[PDB]
Design an enzyme around this catalytic site. Sequence first.
Site, short mmCIF file in Angstrom:
data_model
loop_
_atom_site.label_atom_id
_atom_site.label_comp_id
_atom_site.label_asym_id
_atom_site.label_seq_id
_atom_site.Cartn_x
_atom_site.Cartn_y
_atom_site.Cartn_z
N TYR A 19 0.82 -1.21 0.00
CA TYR A 19 0.00 0.00 0.00
C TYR A 19 0.85 1.26 0.00
O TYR A 19 0.38 2.34 0.34
CB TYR A 19 -0.95 0.00 1.20
CG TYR A 19 -1.86 -1.20 1.19
CD1 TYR A 19 -2.79 -1.37 0.16
CD2 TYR A 19 -1.76 -2.19 2.16
CE1 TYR A 19 -3.58 -2.51 0.10
CE2 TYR A 19 -2.55 -3.34 2.11
CZ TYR A 19 -3.45 -3.49 1.07
OH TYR A 19 -4.23 -4.61 1.00
N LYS A 37 -0.28 3.82 7.79
CA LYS A 37 -0.34 3.35 6.42
C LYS A 37 -1.37 4.24 5.72
O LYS A 37 -2.46 4.48 6.26
CB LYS A 37 -0.78 1.88 6.42
CG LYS A 37 -0.76 1.22 5.06
CD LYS A 37 -0.94 -0.29 5.19
CE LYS A 37 0.26 -0.94 5.88
NZ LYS A 37 0.16 -2.43 5.80
N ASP A 131 -0.40 -13.53 0.71
CA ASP A 131 0.82 -12.94 0.18
C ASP A 131 1.96 -13.00 1.17
O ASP A 131 2.69 -12.02 1.36
CB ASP A 131 0.57 -11.49 -0.25
CG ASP A 131 1.76 -10.88 -0.99
OD1 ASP A 131 2.46 -11.63 -1.71
OD2 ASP A 131 1.99 -9.66 -0.86
N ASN A 136 6.67 -8.94 4.46
CA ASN A 136 5.46 -8.55 5.18
C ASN A 136 5.37 -9.10 6.61
O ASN A 136 4.29 -9.09 7.21
CB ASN A 136 4.22 -8.94 4.40
CG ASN A 136 4.06 -10.41 4.26
OD1 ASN A 136 4.83 -11.07 3.57
ND2 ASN A 136 3.06 -10.96 4.93
N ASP A 149 0.42 -6.89 6.06
CA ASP A 149 0.34 -6.78 4.61
C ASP A 149 -0.41 -7.96 3.99
O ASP A 149 0.06 -8.59 3.04
CB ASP A 149 1.75 -6.68 4.04
CG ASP A 149 1.77 -6.23 2.61
OD1 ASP A 149 2.78 -6.52 1.92
OD2 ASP A 149 0.81 -5.56 2.18
O1 LIG Z 1 -2.61 -3.53 6.22
S1 LIG Z 1 -2.49 -4.88 6.75
O2 LIG Z 1 -1.01 -5.10 7.35
O3 LIG Z 1 -2.71 -5.86 5.68
C1 LIG Z 1 -3.66 -5.19 8.06
C2 LIG Z 1 -3.10 -5.79 9.24
C3 LIG Z 1 -3.87 -6.11 10.37
C4 LIG Z 1 -5.25 -5.84 10.39
C5 LIG Z 1 -5.91 -5.23 9.24
C6 LIG Z 1 -7.31 -4.96 9.27
C7 LIG Z 1 -7.94 -4.37 8.15
C8 LIG Z 1 -7.23 -4.04 6.99
C9 LIG Z 1 -5.82 -4.27 6.85
N1 LIG Z 1 -5.18 -3.95 5.72
C10 LIG Z 1 -5.74 -3.57 4.57
C11 LIG Z 1 -5.40 -2.31 4.01
C12 LIG Z 1 -5.97 -1.88 2.78
C13 LIG Z 1 -6.90 -2.71 2.09
C14 LIG Z 1 -7.25 -3.97 2.63
C15 LIG Z 1 -6.68 -4.41 3.86
C16 LIG Z 1 -5.09 -4.88 7.99
C1 LIG Z 2 0.34 -2.96 8.86
O1 LIG Z 2 1.71 -2.90 8.45
C2 LIG Z 2 2.67 -2.49 9.24
C3 LIG Z 2 2.32 -2.10 10.59
C4 LIG Z 2 3.29 -1.66 11.52
C5 LIG Z 2 4.69 -1.60 11.15
O2 LIG Z 2 5.64 -1.19 12.05
C6 LIG Z 2 5.08 -1.99 9.81
C7 LIG Z 2 6.50 -1.96 9.38
N1 LIG Z 2 7.49 -1.57 10.25
C8 LIG Z 2 8.79 -1.57 9.88
N2 LIG Z 2 9.72 -1.19 10.77
N3 LIG Z 2 9.14 -1.97 8.61
C9 LIG Z 2 8.16 -2.36 7.71
N4 LIG Z 2 8.48 -2.75 6.47
N5 LIG Z 2 6.84 -2.36 8.10
C10 LIG Z 2 4.08 -2.42 8.88
#
Ligand SMILES: O=S(=O)(O)c1cccc2cccc(Nc3ccccc3)c12
Ligand SMILES: COc1ccc(O)c(-c2nc(N)nc(N)n2)c1
EC number: 2.7.11.22
Length: 302
Positions: A19, A37, A131, A136, A149
């Site tokens: 993203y 994010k 994925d 991730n 992710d």
């Molecule tokens: O970002 S992620 O690390 O996948 C993620 C990690 C943990 C919980 C999440 C809950 C909802 C959506 C996410 N992502 C998402 C973002 C955009 C579109 C669809 C899903 C969540």
């Molecule tokens: C939901 O996705 C996430 C949520 C919390 C996070 O800290 C990260 C993350 N953090 C680091 N240090 N690197 C990278 N590449 N990612 C990613």
Amino acid sequence: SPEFMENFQKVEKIGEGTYGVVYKARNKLTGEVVALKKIRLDTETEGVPSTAIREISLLKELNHPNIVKLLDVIHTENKLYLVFEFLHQDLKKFMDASALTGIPLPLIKSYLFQLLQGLAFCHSHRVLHRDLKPQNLLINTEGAIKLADFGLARAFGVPVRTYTHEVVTLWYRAPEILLGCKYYSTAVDIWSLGCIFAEMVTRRALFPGDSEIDQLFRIFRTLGTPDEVVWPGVTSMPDYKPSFPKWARQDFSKVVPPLDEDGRSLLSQMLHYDPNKRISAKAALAHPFFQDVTKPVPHLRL
Ligand SMILES: O=S(=O)(O)c1cccc2cccc(Nc3ccccc3)c12
Ligand SMILES: COc1ccc(O)c(-c2nc(N)nc(N)n2)c1
Ligand SMILES: O=S(=O)(O)c1cccc2cccc(Nc3ccccc3)c12
């Protein structure tokens, strides 16, 4: 009390997942550091499909120590900011920093055990990651590792732009997907984790393909070209071609030299061709490879 983006101070870019850029930020009011994010929504058509909304809702319901914690979702102008707990680094960065020495076995075992716990939880709740890759997976100073992710956007047509740097997802893709299965199962995540397990051990990606057919051939060259005996139904899969070359299976003593009978037994079950025979995350947790699992604290510099 609603949070607003003005409440956050960007500190530094810490990554860029499916993203885009991920920023470490500081909450001006509480001082809490978080990871933000940015999601750009595009109403290209009518909007997010009902099924996609449901899958996002399913993911949001998950509360587990091995799934990165979503703290809040801020809506503003055609955009959403996801506020997550802050984690220091991902498994990919950690492996690269440990490439010349290798991640110690107790840590490899702890991370694999934890990822299986996270996946078992997701799978029992009808959530798949789709994925899984080193990039991730997030690690903290405490020794935990967490799923992040998820491949939801591209799997359910979520109207939101994805990617930033490029792609390399093919390396961890299950063979049933590469062969065009109509419906895949939770087993695809176990295959991906199996590839990651081998990568942590050997310090090199197992199947680094550059196209779908190249990915398939790299898998066949190592595990042998599947036939009806090994994988019932394989020769009738949508993209299966009788013209595929016939390679014999290689010995794991060559594929993952450092691993013993327990590690090799588990890896072989995680990389089984037939999704119906591939080990489940729940069953993997009971494998003897994990008899002596612990929770080592990693050594990371910044
Ligand atoms: O970002 S992620 O690390 O996948 C993620 C990690 C943990 C919980 C999440 C809950 C909802 C959506 C996410 N992502 C998402 C973002 C955009 C579109 C669809 C899903 C969540
Ligand atoms: C939901 O996705 C996430 C949520 C919390 C996070 O800290 C990260 C993350 N953090 C680091 N240090 N690197 C990278 N590449 N990612 C990613
Ligand atoms: O459900 S939310 O918690 O917002 C959500 C959380 C995480 C990722 C999302 C991706 C697309 C749409 C959402 N929902 C949405 C719903 C209405 C308007 C705009 C976006 C997402």
